Every structure is written in C-alpha cells, then in structure tokens.
C-alpha cells in the first residue's frame, strides 16, 4: 500500500477557484477519499497551512509580504470573499478531523511538514503520493514519491523534471529557485536570469553552492555581471527554497517541543 499527503490549503483554493460562493467542506473530504482509495493509500495525511513561516521570515522579514499588500488593496467585497473562503477552509479542515489525520502548526508551512513526514515514514510504504498543484512540492520528488494535481489532472514523477520544471533533478530545481527567484513567495532572484537562462548556468557550473565557489563566473553579459554580485542573495534564497534540507529546522523554529509532538503524532498513524 501507499502513503498520501495532501495540500489542505492548496486544495481549498482549487475549490475556491471553481467557485468562491458555495460551501465545499463535504466534497472536499470525499475528494480525499476517492483519491486515497485510488492511490491504494494506507495512511492518508491532511496538512493545511496556518500563518506565515517562522523559519523563512527570519532569513527574510519580507517573505511573502507581497501577499499582505494584496489584501490591503482588496475592496470591502473581495475582502469578504477572502474571509468567506477561509471560513469554509476551516470547516473543510474540521470535517476532515473526522476521517483523516489533520495537522496544523501555527508558524510552520505545509511543505515543511510533508517533507518531514516523508523523511520520517516514507520508507514504510511502496509509494508516496502528495496531493497539490504547487510545483514547489516537486522538490520532494523521487522514484517513490510523486504528486497529483486537479488543476491539470496530471501526476508528477521524477523523470518529468525537465518538461515541468526546466531542470533535471531536485537539487537543480532548488538552485534554480534560489537563483531565478520566486515571484510568488516574494523572493528576489538575480536580475536577468530566468528558467532557461538559469538552468544553463546550472548545467555548466553546477549548483548554487558549487557556483558560489566558482564566482566570479566568466562572460561579459550583465545577467552574468549581476550574478557575480549577488552571492549573498543566493545563500538566503537557498535556505528558503531548499525544502528537503531545512524542513526539520523550519519545524524546530516554532519549538523543539512542537516538533516532538508532531513526530510522535506521525509515527502513531504510520504504525
Ligand atoms: Mn505552500
Ligand atoms: Mn512558487
């Protein structure tokens, strides 16, 4: 049998997208029941996000701050919509507490937990299926851990790292994130180097850190010039995007005690 780890909030937003007026708690869980049934799940795990990350915020105070800007400018009607959704998200998360183990730790994101769970009990299953539409989860991809999105109805394995992410492996995808930037999570990257232009430098010189050693890099191009004068930036970005390496840390940030309760809480279900 397999293990399934869903992206509680990500799915919520999907339901919201489809319709931001109708309650979706009921179908929400049913969707996680069919899926679990389908992926021969043995342990279904539901994880939702709650508050900004404590780990990231430290290495970057303005982390996801753009998302706060957006709420600030929302109209009285849209703000209401946002609150409506979240309410429905909470309810969708409460109903879940009746069928699937649901976790939430204020200060810790979801990708930080799912990486821990996988790192923690992954070996106890044949496969591991993560339910999300967030390609950032693809940093956990292996030949025994993949992801499935509804927004496309596509599954994602490792061999597909080039078509879906313009890189060859997890370490690469990371470095590309720490180099190119993540407009979403509000993270500044080298001015001038995107996916295609960034992968090249990664294919030639290596990964972020391997590249740090090598600076200054040759070439007279500005994005190259900019690159050479943005080392400090790569260090910070690498710790914000390298999910599989800093997750434990990201959890211990909100408490060496919380991390413990979560650890025992997982194995309890895994066993
Ligand atoms: Mn997330
Ligand atoms: Mn992103």
Swiss-Prot record:
Effect seen on changing residue 96 to S: Complete loss of inhibition by PHMB
Reported cofactor(s): Mg(2+); K(+)
Stimuli inducing this protein: Expressed in the early phase of the viral replicative cycle.
Residues the entry annotates as binding Mg(2+) 3: 136, 182
Mechanisms controlling activity: Inhibited by p-hydroxymercuribenzoate (PHMB).
InterPro entries from the UniProt entry: 5-3_exonucl_a-hlix_arch_N (IPR020046), 5-3_exonuclease (IPR002421), 5-3_exonuclease_C_sf (IPR036279), DNA_polI_H3TH (IPR020045), FEN (IPR038969), FEN_D15-like (IPR043666), HhH2 (IPR008918), PIN-like_dom_sf (IPR029060)
UniProt GO cellular component terms: viral replication complex
Record domain 5'-3' exonuclease: where: 171-244
Residues annotated for Mg(2+) 1 binding in this entry: 111
A biological-process GO annotation: late viral transcription
Outcome recorded upon mutating residue 247 to S: Complete loss of inhibition by PHMB
Reactions performed catalytically: Exonucleolytic cleavage in the 5'- to 3'-direction to yield nucleoside 5'-phosphates
Location of the region described as Helical arch in the Swiss-Prot/TrEMBL record: 63-97
EC number per UniProt: 3.1.11.-, 3.1.11.3
Chain spans, region DNA-binding: 169-205
Residue sites binding Mg(2+) 2 per the record: 111, 134, 136
Effect listed in the UniProt record for changing residue 153 to A: 10 fold increase in the dissociation constant for pseudo-Y binding. No effect on 5'overhangs binding
Gene Ontology MF terms: 5'-3' DNA exonuclease activity; 5'-3' exonuclease activity; 5'-flap endonuclease activity; DNA binding; DNA exonuclease activity; double-stranded DNA 5'-3' DNA exonuclease activity; double-stranded DNA endonuclease activity; metal ion binding
UniProt domain comment: Three alpha-helices form a helical arch which forms a hole in the protein and through which the 5' flap of the scissile ssDNA is threaded.
Chain's role: Catalyzes both the 5'-exonucleolytic and structure-specific endonucleolytic hydrolysis of DNA branched nucleic acid molecules and probably plays a role in viral genome replication. Active on flap (branched duplex DNA containing a free single-stranded 5'-end), 5'overhangs and pseudo-Y structures. The substrates require a free, single-stranded 5' end, with endonucleolytic hydrolysis occurring at the junction of double- and single-stranded DNA. This function may be used for example to trim such branched molecules generated by Okazaki fragments synthesis during replication.
Protein known as: Flap endonuclease
Organism expressing this protein natively: Escherichia phage T5
Gene name for this UniProt entry: D15
């Amino acid at each position: 049998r397999n293990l399934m780890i869903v992206d509680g909030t990500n799915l919520g937003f999907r339901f919201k997208h489809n319709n931001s007026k109708k309650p979706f708690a009921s179908s929400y869980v049913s969707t996680i029941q069919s899926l679990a049934k389908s992926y021969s799940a043995r342990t279904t795990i539901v994880l939702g996000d709650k508050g900004k990350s404590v780990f990231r915020l430290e290495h970057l105070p303005e982390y996801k701050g753009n998302r706060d800007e957006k709420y600030a400018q929302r109209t009285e009607e849209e703000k209401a919509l946002d609150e409506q959704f979240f309410e429905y998200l909470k309810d969708a998360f409460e109903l879940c507490k009746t069928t699937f183990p649901t976790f939430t730790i204020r200060g810790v994101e979801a990708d930080d937990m799912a990486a821990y769970i996988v790192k923690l009990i992954g070996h106890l299953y044949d496969h591991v299926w993560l339910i999300s539409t967030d390609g950032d989860w693809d940093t956990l991809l292996t030949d025994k851990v993949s992801r499935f999105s509804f927004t496309t109805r596509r599954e994602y394995h490792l061999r597909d790292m080039y078509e879906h992410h313009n890189v060859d492996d997890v370490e690469q995808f990371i470095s590309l994130k720490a180099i190119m930037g993540d407009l979403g999570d509000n993270i500044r990257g080298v001015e001038g180097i995107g996916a295609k232009r960034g992968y090249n430098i990664i294919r030639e010189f290596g990964n972020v850190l391997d590249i740090i050693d090598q600076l200054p890099l040759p070439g007279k191009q500005k994005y190259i010039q900019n690159l050479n004068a943005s080392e400090e930036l790569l260090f910070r970005n690498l710790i914000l995007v390298d999910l599989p390496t800093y997750c434990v840390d990201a959890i211990a940030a909100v408490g060496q005690d919380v991390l413990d309760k979560f650890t025992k809480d997982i194995l309890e279900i895994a066993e």
